[PDB]
Amino acid sequence: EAEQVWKLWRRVLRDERLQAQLFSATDATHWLSGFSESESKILSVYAQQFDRVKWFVENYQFRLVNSFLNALETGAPLSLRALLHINVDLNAQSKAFLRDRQWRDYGPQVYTYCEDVLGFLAEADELQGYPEILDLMRLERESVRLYRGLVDPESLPADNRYQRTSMARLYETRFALSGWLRQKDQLGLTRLPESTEHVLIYLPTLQARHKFTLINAQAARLYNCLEQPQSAAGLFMLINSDSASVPGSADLALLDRLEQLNAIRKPL
Amino acid sequence: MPDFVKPAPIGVGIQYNPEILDWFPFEDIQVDILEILLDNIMAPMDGPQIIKPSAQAMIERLGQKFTLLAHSNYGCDFGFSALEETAAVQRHVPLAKMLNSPWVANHCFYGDQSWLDIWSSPIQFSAAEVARCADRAQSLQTLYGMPLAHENAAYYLECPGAEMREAEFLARLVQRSGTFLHLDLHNIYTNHLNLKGFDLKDYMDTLPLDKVISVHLAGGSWHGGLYHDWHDACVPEPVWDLYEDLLSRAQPSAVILEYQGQAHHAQTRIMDASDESMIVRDVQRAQAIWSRYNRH
C-alpha cells in the first residue's frame, strides 16, 4: 500500500470520533463498518495491534488540546492570562473547540488557529459573563488579524494620497481596556468602566513584537476616513464638519502621530 | 568533495532547556554546544515573521558563549506537500542560518500525526520511499546550505507496506540523497527492547556509520506503561554501550544529551542529591568516552 493512502487514512481516522469508536467496538465480516476495501486492508495490518493504535489516537487528541493553549499564547497572550486568572476550564473549551472544528490540526498556522479560537470563546456560554474579557479577546483578535494581513500584504501604491499601511489596525473598545494593558496582574479579575477607547495595534518594524497605543477621537477619525486611499482634499473634507478641504487644527499633527506609529503614509 | 562533508569534531553538548542554564556548572564542565529546537523558536507560518521576536533576543545571548545546533522536528521535511510549502523551507531553513548552525538535524517521520517524545509514526520502509524521501532530502540539503542529518525514530507499530529493514532504508536513503545521519541510541535500544526481530547488531552493521555527524544520548523518556525508564530517566547503560561502539567504529562530530523536561519523579524531592547533578555526571562520562576515542 502506498503510504500516502496510509496517512490519508489516518487523518480521517484521527478526525472522526464515530469511526474511532467502531474500532474498539467491533471488527466485522461485512467490510468492517464505514471503511473501504483498501482502508480495511490497511486496517487489518493493525488488527493485532488495536490497543496501541487506540493509544496513538488518544495521544494525538491530547496534543491538540495542548496546541490550543500555545495558539492562545502566540496570539492573544493577555486574553490567556485573563482566562487563567478567572480559571475558565480551558481543557473543556479546547475539547469543545476541536470537536466542533472536527479535530483540525492547524499546525504552523497559529494565527489562524488563534483567530478561530477567539471567535469560539466569544460565543462560549461560560464567557458570556465577564464582558470586559470579551472586549480583550476582540482586541487581541485584531492583533492576530494584523499579523495575518502582513502575509502577502496586498501592495504598496506609493501614490500622492494619504493612505493606510498594512502594519497597523484600529480597535474601538467598549470598556477602558487600557487599565488592564498597564497592570497585567489585574487581567480578567477587576471590573472596568464602559468607555470607548481607540486602541491602535501596530508593528514598528516588520520583525518586531506588536504594541498597543491609544489614539484620540480625531486621530481615530482620520484613520477611519483613510479606510480607502483618499486625497489631501478628500481626507479633510470628509472629517471636517464644514467640508472645508483644508486641514483642521489637530489633523496635521495627528496625521504625524499616525505615521510615526506606522499607521498611514503621507502623500508623496 | 560532495559539496557537503562531515565537519570536524566539536565535542559534547546538551539540548537547550531554560532550567539547565540556571544550575549547570559552566567554568567547571566544558560545554560548547547547544541544540536549539527550530520549531520552538519559529514564528507562525500564517504570519510575516520568521523568528518570534521574544526568541530572537534569547538566541544572541546564547550564541556568544555556545555554538548553536539546529533541530527540526515538526517541519514537514518528509511530507507529501511540496517542499517549498513546508515549514522546513519557509521557517526552518532561515532559522538555522540565523543560528549559524554547523549542521541541521531532521527526523525520519511524518510531521503530522507524530509527537517526538510520546507517540511517533515511522516512514514506510519501501523502495518508493527511499526514492521519494532522498529526492526531498537532496533538495532540502541544498536549500539548508549545510549538512542535513536524519534522526532515526522509535516506533511501536510498523508502517504498512514495509519492504526492507529500518537500517537499509536509512542506508539506501543517505547514499541516494548524500545526506548524513543523527543517531538517537536510545531509540535503537527502545526498538530492540519492544519491537520483535529488531537486531541491534544488524542495525549498526548495516548503517553507514561514517555518515553519522551527530549522536543523541538521552535519558529514559516517559511513556505510560512502557518498560523503558526502568530504573531512572537517565542515560541507560545499554545506551552507553552503543555510544562506545559508535565511537569504536566511527568518528561523529558531536554528541547531545537532553533534559527532556519532566521524566522521573519521586516521593522525596528526587531519588538523588540532584538528577540535575546526574546530568553533570552523565556529561562527564560522555566527555571521557569522547576523549578516550579522540582521534586528534
Residue numbers in the entry:
A (entry chain C): 2 to 269
B (entry chain D): 1 to 296
Direct quotes from the study:
Unlike the reported homologous structure of MbnB,32,33 no extra electron density in the active center of the TglH map was observed, suggesting that the crystallized protein lacks metal ions, and therefore, this structure was termed apoTglHI. ApoTglH adopts an eight-stranded triosephosphate isomerase (TIM)-barrel fold consisting of eight β-strands wrapped around ten α-helixes and two η-helixes. TglI consists of an N-terminal helix domain (NTD), a linker loop, and a C-terminal domain (CTD) identified as an RRE domain. Two extended loops of apoTglH, L1 (residues 41–53) and L3 (residues 151–166), are inserted into two grooves formed by α7–8 (G2) and α1–3 (G1) of the TglI NTD, respectively, forming a mortise and tenon-like structure. L1 embedded in G2 thereby forms a hydrophobic interface I with a buried surface area of ~573 Å2. Moreover, L3 buried in G1 forms a hydrophobic interface II with a buried surface area of ~320 Å2. Notably, the TglI CTD is not involved in the interaction between apoTglH and TglI, likely because of the role of the CTD in recognition of the longer LP of the cognate substrate. Although apoTglH and MbnB exhibit comparable overall structures, the specific inter-subunit interactions of apoTglHI are distinct from those of MbnBC. In the closed state, two iron ions are bound in the active site (TglHI-2Fe), whereas in the open state, iron ions are absent from the active site (apoTglHI), indicating that the intrinsic flexibility of L2 and L4 allows Fe loading in TglH to result in TglHI activation.
